[PDB]
Structure 1
């Protein structure tokens, strides 16, 4: 058959993995609720690059109107879970 169904824990772990592979973010400092603009001191271009990295990670495109408001890892996890119908 095809790939096993995706889970919330896997989504969050993969999001944190991608963010910890980013150089402008301290691995120790980073948290699921860590704000990008406020806590990590990032700008809009870094957020765009993070969104593109998430799209490359999960193999699907996020529209620009929705990606504008993903300012913490938890929001990205919620968006991915709701789009792919992941409930547990």
Structure 2
């Protein structure tokens, strides 16, 4: 029923959520910006991020591949690749 996603609508939502996480500054979040080496978050906060995304887009990122959703972009192509968005 609902309209299909886009590679720039699956990117604005991913940045949106993260900009609402208090620890991640909302003005230094850039899609090519790593969660743990550039933004500062710890390991436990990666799980929490991914989980937000799993709840924003309604599906489960397999842990073995979720253990690596580091860049705030990998999340944007992985979500899209899993949902077949060729833009």
Q: TM-score range by the shorter chain?
A: over 0.9
**Which residue pairs with 2:16 in the alignment?**
17
TM-score (norm 2): 0.97
After superposition, what is the alpha-carbon deviation per residue over 1:17-60, rounded to whole angstroms, capped at 9, x for unaligned? 00000000111111001101111111110000001100010010
**In structure 2, C-alpha distance between the alignment counterparts of 1:5 and 1:39, rounded to whole Å:** 32
Task: Give unmatched runs, 5+ long, in structure 1.
Answer: none
Secondary structure, counterpart of 2:9 in structure 1: helix
Secondary structure, counterpart of 1:85 in structure 2: coil
**In structure 1, C-alpha distance between the alignment counterparts of 2:80 and 2:58, rounded to whole Å:** 14
TM-score (norm 1): 0.96
Q: How many residues align?
A: 87
**In structure 1, C-alpha distance between the alignment counterparts of 2:44 and 2:17, rounded to whole Å:** 17
Shift of the alpha carbon at 1:72? Answer: 1.1
Q: Which runs of 4+ in 1 moved over 4 A?
A: none
Which protein is richer in helix relative to its size?
1
Shift of the alpha carbon at 1:73? Answer: 1.4
